[PDB]
Design an enzyme around this catalytic site. Structure first.
Site, PDB file in Angstrom:
ATOM      1  N   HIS B  67       0.803  -1.197   0.000  1.00  0.00           N
ATOM      2  CA  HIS B  67       0.000   0.000   0.000  1.00  0.00           C
ATOM      3  C   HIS B  67       0.840   1.253   0.000  1.00  0.00           C
ATOM      4  O   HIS B  67       0.341   2.300  -0.333  1.00  0.00           O
ATOM      5  CB  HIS B  67      -1.028   0.003   1.150  1.00  0.00           C
ATOM      6  CG  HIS B  67      -0.437  -0.156   2.520  1.00  0.00           C
ATOM      7  ND1 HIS B  67      -0.142  -1.387   3.070  1.00  0.00           N
ATOM      8  CD2 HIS B  67      -0.111   0.759   3.466  1.00  0.00           C
ATOM      9  CE1 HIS B  67       0.343  -1.225   4.288  1.00  0.00           C
ATOM     10  NE2 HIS B  67       0.369   0.068   4.551  1.00  0.00           N
ATOM     11  N   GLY B 156       0.849  -5.429   9.425  1.00  0.00           N
ATOM     12  CA  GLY B 156      -0.028  -6.268   8.636  1.00  0.00           C
ATOM     13  C   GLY B 156       0.585  -7.556   8.142  1.00  0.00           C
ATOM     14  O   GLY B 156       0.013  -8.619   8.344  1.00  0.00           O
ATOM     15  N   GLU B 416       1.539 -24.793   2.843  1.00  0.00           N
ATOM     16  CA  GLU B 416       1.101 -24.598   1.465  1.00  0.00           C
ATOM     17  C   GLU B 416       1.071 -23.152   1.008  1.00  0.00           C
ATOM     18  O   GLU B 416       1.588 -22.857  -0.076  1.00  0.00           O
ATOM     19  CB  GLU B 416      -0.247 -25.247   1.199  1.00  0.00           C
ATOM     20  CG  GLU B 416      -0.271 -26.737   1.494  1.00  0.00           C
ATOM     21  CD  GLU B 416      -0.637 -27.074   2.951  1.00  0.00           C
ATOM     22  OE1 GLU B 416      -1.141 -26.197   3.685  1.00  0.00           O
ATOM     23  OE2 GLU B 416      -0.459 -28.250   3.349  1.00  0.00           O
TER      24      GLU B 416
HETATM   25  C1  LIG Z   1      -4.031 -28.584   5.592  1.00  0.00           C
HETATM   26  C2  LIG Z   1      -3.359 -29.837   5.473  1.00  0.00           C
HETATM   27  N1  LIG Z   1      -2.152 -29.879   4.868  1.00  0.00           N
HETATM   28  C3  LIG Z   1      -1.533 -31.071   4.673  1.00  0.00           C
HETATM   29  C4  LIG Z   1      -2.143 -32.239   5.060  1.00  0.00           C
HETATM   30  C5  LIG Z   1      -1.449 -33.607   4.932  1.00  0.00           C
HETATM   31  N2  LIG Z   1      -0.922 -34.284   6.219  1.00  0.00           N
HETATM   32  C6  LIG Z   1      -1.661 -35.084   7.056  1.00  0.00           C
HETATM   33  S1  LIG Z   1      -0.779 -35.580   8.392  1.00  0.00           S
HETATM   34  C7  LIG Z   1       0.530 -34.534   7.847  1.00  0.00           C
HETATM   35  C8  LIG Z   1       1.750 -34.186   8.644  1.00  0.00           C
HETATM   36  C9  LIG Z   1       2.042 -34.966   9.855  1.00  0.00           C
HETATM   37  O1  LIG Z   1       1.533 -34.125  10.906  1.00  0.00           O
HETATM   38  P1  LIG Z   1       1.761 -34.271  12.449  1.00  0.00           P
HETATM   39  O2  LIG Z   1       0.828 -33.280  13.081  1.00  0.00           O
HETATM   40  O3  LIG Z   1       3.147 -33.873  12.535  1.00  0.00           O
HETATM   41  O4  LIG Z   1       1.697 -35.790  12.667  1.00  0.00           O
HETATM   42  P2  LIG Z   1       1.707 -37.009  13.627  1.00  0.00           P
HETATM   43  O5  LIG Z   1       3.100 -37.349  13.926  1.00  0.00           O
HETATM   44  O6  LIG Z   1       0.938 -36.529  14.821  1.00  0.00           O
HETATM   45  O7  LIG Z   1       1.023 -38.110  12.947  1.00  0.00           O
HETATM   46  C10 LIG Z   1       0.355 -34.220   6.548  1.00  0.00           C
HETATM   47  C11 LIG Z   1       1.316 -33.533   5.671  1.00  0.00           C
HETATM   48  C12 LIG Z   1      -3.336 -32.087   5.851  1.00  0.00           C
HETATM   49  N3  LIG Z   1      -3.854 -33.097   6.514  1.00  0.00           N
HETATM   50  N4  LIG Z   1      -3.823 -30.838   6.149  1.00  0.00           N
HETATM   51  C1  LIG Z   2      -4.518  -9.942   2.656  1.00  0.00           C
HETATM   52  C2  LIG Z   2      -4.985  -8.619   2.915  1.00  0.00           C
HETATM   53  N1  LIG Z   2      -5.738  -8.414   3.996  1.00  0.00           N
HETATM   54  C3  LIG Z   2      -6.180  -7.150   4.314  1.00  0.00           C
HETATM   55  C4  LIG Z   2      -5.871  -6.083   3.541  1.00  0.00           C
HETATM   56  C5  LIG Z   2      -6.374  -4.724   3.841  1.00  0.00           C
HETATM   57  N2  LIG Z   2      -5.219  -3.975   4.428  1.00  0.00           N
HETATM   58  C6  LIG Z   2      -4.640  -2.968   3.755  1.00  0.00           C
HETATM   59  S1  LIG Z   2      -3.745  -1.952   4.751  1.00  0.00           S
HETATM   60  C7  LIG Z   2      -4.062  -2.984   6.069  1.00  0.00           C
HETATM   61  C8  LIG Z   2      -3.787  -2.465   7.449  1.00  0.00           C
HETATM   62  C9  LIG Z   2      -2.531  -1.672   7.654  1.00  0.00           C
HETATM   63  O1  LIG Z   2      -1.422  -2.579   7.751  1.00  0.00           O
HETATM   64  P1  LIG Z   2      -0.034  -2.054   8.186  1.00  0.00           P
HETATM   65  O2  LIG Z   2       0.993  -3.076   7.757  1.00  0.00           O
HETATM   66  O3  LIG Z   2      -0.271  -1.890   9.602  1.00  0.00           O
HETATM   67  O4  LIG Z   2       0.149  -0.609   7.534  1.00  0.00           O
HETATM   68  P2  LIG Z   2       0.523   0.896   7.879  1.00  0.00           P
HETATM   69  O5  LIG Z   2      -0.798   1.504   8.066  1.00  0.00           O
HETATM   70  O6  LIG Z   2       1.397   0.830   9.061  1.00  0.00           O
HETATM   71  O7  LIG Z   2       1.249   1.481   6.745  1.00  0.00           O
HETATM   72  C10 LIG Z   2      -4.972  -3.946   5.719  1.00  0.00           C
HETATM   73  C11 LIG Z   2      -5.875  -4.639   6.616  1.00  0.00           C
HETATM   74  C12 LIG Z   2      -5.024  -6.348   2.449  1.00  0.00           C
HETATM   75  N3  LIG Z   2      -4.631  -5.422   1.654  1.00  0.00           N
HETATM   76  N4  LIG Z   2      -4.691  -7.650   2.095  1.00  0.00           N
END
Ligand SMILES: Cc1ncc(C[n+]2csc(CCOP(=O)(O)OP(=O)(O)O)c2C)c(N)n1
Ligand SMILES: Cc1ncc(C[n+]2csc(CCOP(=O)(O)OP(=O)(O)O)c2C)c(N)n1
Ligand SMILES: [Ca+2]
Ligand SMILES: [Ca+2]
EC number: 2.2.1.1
Lengths: 678, 678
Positions: B67, B156, B416
């Protein structure tokens, strides 16, 4: 002190989970193995009632690391919930009550987890809601609310940014009753954590203002676990994180190896585990009677009696405080105040041109005092979303001096994904809570991981999404949505409202709030839009309807939001050239598709070309329109009007396209796109 | 040593951003006013050549707080970049080169920013790529790569989880050349940061492994700022964060207030600032010749000189190491190896059934040694995504003992959103970097924020999205995509491949790797799928093609991915009842629409009913078919086959639908969905 029986229970859980994963020849056995002691310890001191999973003041548990489900099911079964060995035996099979990840719909399961990072954030929701219920109804002598929120999480949850946003806010809000237990096992799918995760977790958590307790021996130290939990309950000013070290798949020949993570143990390995822990290596799903007797005794029977003392306290409360008690009793039934919608704003054509974002503010001001269960907030865009009513008090810790826990306005910060999961948690807490969160429609996209779960589980949360299109203007393409609505209209069970005026905004909230299983997204404009002649709450509540009508129309214009007005003006220019246009307003695909077919076809019939008008992606319009006028390229920067003319969205521009659609079809017979062949 | 000229330069910058925002009567004046001093100090010591913004060894800068563009634009003009006062005078206006938020297409602008959290995450990608290039081509006597990556961020970006994700990976990798300067101004949209963000950022970043430095008078201490940057450049094993305290809107009658955050100053207010700073309160866009001359002396001319030096040293490199020099020379030109596409695998109907997920692995195996610029990875799903070739070395710090910086396989962990953004940084770096990353299709949604910008900016990054549907099985609905593709097919400029077989996977990688301005998503199958008779790299590269043909078909069946084969089997079934089906494979909507209309029309001609088949949302199919056979509800936990049969996707089940479709349109005159009226 624990005894021989607690050790047998811990041993009945480990093996029951293994047996549950093995039979499905699909699942994750490691975490449940390494987490049995902590789970046994935790569940024994949790105040709950297996006989009534909905009791409002029940300590709430959350398996943020969703894949360990096997663990969860074991506990639910052993402790008295309606889940039998048979259900355990149909784990992961089509149509069973035991799916691969906890689903919100099953008794004893508080939210749907699986996707990493989502459970821990939901839990923050469940604690904000508790803090509020307590501050709002507790009275000297009547402690109706005081439950705790327990979370189980793994390395994955702690790596997903969403748990960082959530945790940051949890430290700020000083949520003393939130106690998170971390499965510090040193392994994830790709192998060792040191390969991509060697940060100082406890140090990062102290920086949020959380207290961090350590339990070096999570494999056997029952006394220390129970003690860590105890210590955690004394610090009511800081949420607590317990870093508990365990060996994944403890008991297996491959304990500590990632192979045990997401795959069933080898039959060979399952046998020794049992022989080791003192069971018969040849029998499956065996639960010692003494285990059942133990849990009935220490959990079910006491829990049941805790629920009984509570209900009668609530009876005395209703005598002592009629107004507040009747209100709580209402929220507990899930019913909204009677005739509440009678306080919803209505308008007429003579009224003033107002951007729906403003109109939205005015619904909030009118209804907030009618619905004590409406708790709202914005993600650092309060002055843009206009999401805050006047006589509002911010939900903050008493020590802030800027609000307190009775407040109903939340400052989420620039944390869209966490807001999504936190609102899901507020809704799931119960007591008819109705959370709403504001942000710019193009940034709702940052919360898709959570928005999907509100739909999948059916948490009726409301997203107040302002700045719905290129009407944003100067901010440009990084801020102008193009593909958002089409994306959400492609996700099942979610209302995507794009009201066009005051009455259509009222219909948006009426439907949105009365909903009990379907979330909603209300896309609001930045720019001023006029009040339409023909709109009304009654019609608009059906999702789609005929704004203006003509006998025997030459064409039908289907539009939404800011484009319904333009279309009405396009029609005027068309009448001038003797072309009869019927104008249909479609404020929500979802709600419309829910109307009986005979209504829909009366709105979108055969024998007339239908063209749609909306300043966004045309990919979802084929279900109602023959030809679509919209945008399938990124927006631009410049004054909003200059941008709209740039894209052809002027009354004449639309009219011209209507004419071309009519000429293109002269002589062809047309069939409503609404008609499916199978 | 900073003198009066340095003080004059800084004023000219503040005032210049102020004039720029005000003529636009739109914009954010706060941060530009507050970060002018840091911008001056930093750029004055950045090794860059304004005449050639593509010199590979240029120091890189990224304004994460997008911004604050007026600051970036002021810097660009003063330092000698191709941007003028007339351009600045049309800031935020339609068709101008000065959009409300920095765009990748402008020279000097490293990547597109505006959405919070992206910029800081990209800078990380750029620093990894720098580490790589240096480790891959630097030789004793020839330091070809050694540039720094400077970043400007605010509260932000620190509040958005994507930055917690990226900074967590940055600390693990020890990205020493990555210097971040945080505008610690105590304010955000809603108000004071104490209202929702009071964590200990310094303590949190230290836990990540970064180094934290401080400058407490960022509003006037050019000295401390320089010392901090120099101190920063000394820690070659830790990224540095410099917590620089500033006052938002410094100079203004409202400095410290948030009303100067995202709104233009008052005319009267702009005046007092100019006077106060020595300038004339009645004139606009004034730059003292002294400032032009200064930045010419200290920035342009020295940088040009350096580029030249680098240029000479590079021709010596090419002489000394012919093979390696030849390689970099090719990459810096943007050409892929000659005939590389000959190394892509091809199959026939007689080769065994392989999952598209495995086939993808085979391509990676084959091309890795052909394309030195291919850097890949996974988000904790290496064994499931099959994204790592055998002889791969991971990208890590040498001290780890697990790999080194020259490696080409990145272990992202469960992050991700950060990965798509880091991929954007790497691609953005240059040297024909071709990054890819894998995760389950469903969780690519978790990274939507980065993906949108890959499309918007035109970064040819690649997502190897596996487990593309209900074919996933027992994991259930929280893990089966339904809306994903329909979502990504509604976003402009992005390929969504969903290859049905071996040949189609190659066509997917060819087009993807050959792309210079469009990112990609290749949806691969978990389960095995037979090789089709009629598929081929050449045809699939067109995005859609007649797989099986018949003279005078009664119906055309269009499918994608695993449904192409199911469609082929249904046709066999339909043939037995004397119904002629033509089967079309549409591997990618994007690529298809890129073909000439007459070709498209030969694939989907008039007069024949068309029905599509795909086990995902039907919403996007209306632009191609008359009737769609898809899944518009969440999925299920069960054995893959049973889930398919449960939803109707069987040979006779598709055939049955095709028959109803033929019956429904019997006698009617049918027009191709491709034909548009206007
Ligand atoms: C949002 C999302 N990203 C990726 C996956 C794939 N996933 C499932 S288990 C896992 C990682 C292992 O996680 P953890 O909490 O460390 O496992 P534990 O040793 O308790 O089985 C992955 C990559 C998912 N389930 N959710
Ligand atoms: C992902 C995302 N979420 C929200 C916004 C809206 N946004 C723009 S400025 C800002 C707040 C100000 O952030 P900061 O880093 O504190 O800026 P400063 O005012 O200090 O310059 C937000 C919420 C955005 N642009 N993108
Ligand atoms: Ca783990
Ligand atoms: Ca700030």
């Amino acid at each position: 002190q624990f005894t021989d029986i607690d050790k047998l229970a811990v041993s009945t859980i480990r093996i029951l989970a293994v047996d549950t994963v093995s039979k499905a020849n699909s699942g994750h056995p490691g975490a449940p193995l390494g987490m049995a002691p902590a789970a046994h310890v935790l569940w024994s001191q949790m105040r709950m009632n297996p006989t009534n999973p909905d009791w409002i003041n029940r300590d709430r548990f959350v398996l943020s690391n969703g894949h360990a489900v096997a663990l969860l099911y074991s506990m639910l079964h052993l402790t008295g919930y309606d889940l039998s060995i048979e259900d355990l035996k149909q784990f992961r099979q089509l149509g069973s009550r035991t799916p691969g990840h906890p689903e919100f719909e099953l008794p004893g399961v508080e939210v749907t987890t699986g996707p990493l990072g989502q459970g821990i954030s939901n839990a923050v929701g469940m604690a904000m809601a508790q803090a509020n219920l307590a501050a709002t109804y507790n009275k000297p002598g009547f402690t109706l609310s005081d439950n705790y929120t327990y979370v189980f999480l793994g390395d994955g949850c702690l790596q997903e940014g969403i748990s960082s946003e959530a945790s940051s806010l949890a430290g700020h809000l000083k949520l003393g009753n939130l106690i998170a237990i971390y499965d510090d096992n040193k392994i994830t799918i790709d192998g060792a954590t040191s390969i991509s995760f060697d940060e100082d977790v406890a140090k990062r958590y102290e920086a949020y203002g959380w207290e961090v307790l350590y339990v070096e021996n999570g494999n056997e130290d029952l006394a220390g676990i129970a003690k860590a939990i105890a210590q955690a309950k004394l610090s009511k000013d800081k949420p607590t994180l317990i870093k508990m070290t365990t060996t994944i798949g403890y008991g297996s020949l491959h304990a500590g190896s990632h192979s045990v993570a997401g795959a069933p143990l080898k039959a060979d390995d399952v046998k020794q585990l049992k022989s080791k822990f003192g069971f018969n290596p040849d029998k499956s799903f065996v639960v010692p009677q003494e285990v059942y007797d133990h849990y009935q005794k220490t959990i079910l029977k006491p829990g049941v009696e805790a629920n009984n003392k509570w209900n009668k306290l609530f009876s005395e409360y209703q005598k002592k405080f009629p107004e507040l008690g009747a209100e709580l009793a209402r929220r507990l039934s899930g019913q909204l105040p009677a005739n509440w919608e009678s306080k919803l704003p209505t308008y007429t054509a003579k009224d003033s041109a107002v951007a729906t974002r403003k109109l939205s503010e005015t619904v909030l001001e009118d209804v907030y005092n009618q619905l004590p269960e409406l708790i709202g907030g914005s993600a650092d865009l309060t002055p843009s979303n206009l999401t805050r009513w006047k006589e509002a008090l911010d939900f903050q810790p008493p020590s802030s001096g800027s609000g307190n826990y009775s407040g109903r306005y939340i400052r989420y910060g620039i944390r869209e994904h966490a807001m999504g999961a936190i609102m899901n948690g507020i809704s799931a807490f119960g007591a008819n809570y109705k959370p709403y969160g504001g942000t710019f429609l193009n940034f709702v996209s940052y919360a898709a991981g959570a928005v999907r779960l509100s739909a999948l589980s059916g948490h009726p949360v409301i997203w107040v999404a302002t700045h719905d299109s290129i009407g944003v203007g100067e901010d440009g393409p990084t801020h102008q949505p193009i593909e958002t609505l089409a994306h959400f209209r492609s996700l099942p069970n979610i209302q995507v409202w794009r009201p066009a005026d005051g009455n259509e905004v009222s219909a948006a909230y009426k439907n949105s709030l009365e909903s009990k299983h379907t979330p909603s997204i209300i896309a609001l404009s930045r720019q001023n839009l006029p009040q339409l002649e023909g709109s009304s709450i009654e019609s608009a509540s059906k999702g789609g309807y005929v704004l203006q009508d003509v006998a025997n129309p030459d064409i039908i214009l289907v539009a939404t939001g800011s484009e319904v007005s333009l279309s009405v003006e396009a029609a005027k220019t068309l009448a001038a050239k003797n072309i009869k246009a019927r104008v249909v307003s479609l404020p929500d695909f979802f709600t419309f598709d829910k109307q009986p077919l005979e209504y829909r076809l009366s709105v979108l019939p055969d024998n007339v070309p239908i063209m749609s008008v909306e300043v966004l992606a045309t990919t979802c319009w084929g279900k109602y329109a023959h030809q679509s006028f919209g945008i399938d390229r990124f927006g631009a920067s410049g004054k909003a009007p200059e941008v709209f003319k740039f894209f052809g969205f002027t009354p004449e521009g639309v009219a011209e396209r209507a004419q071309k659609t009519i000429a293109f079809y002269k002589g062809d017979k047309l069939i409503s796109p609404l008609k499916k062949a199978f």
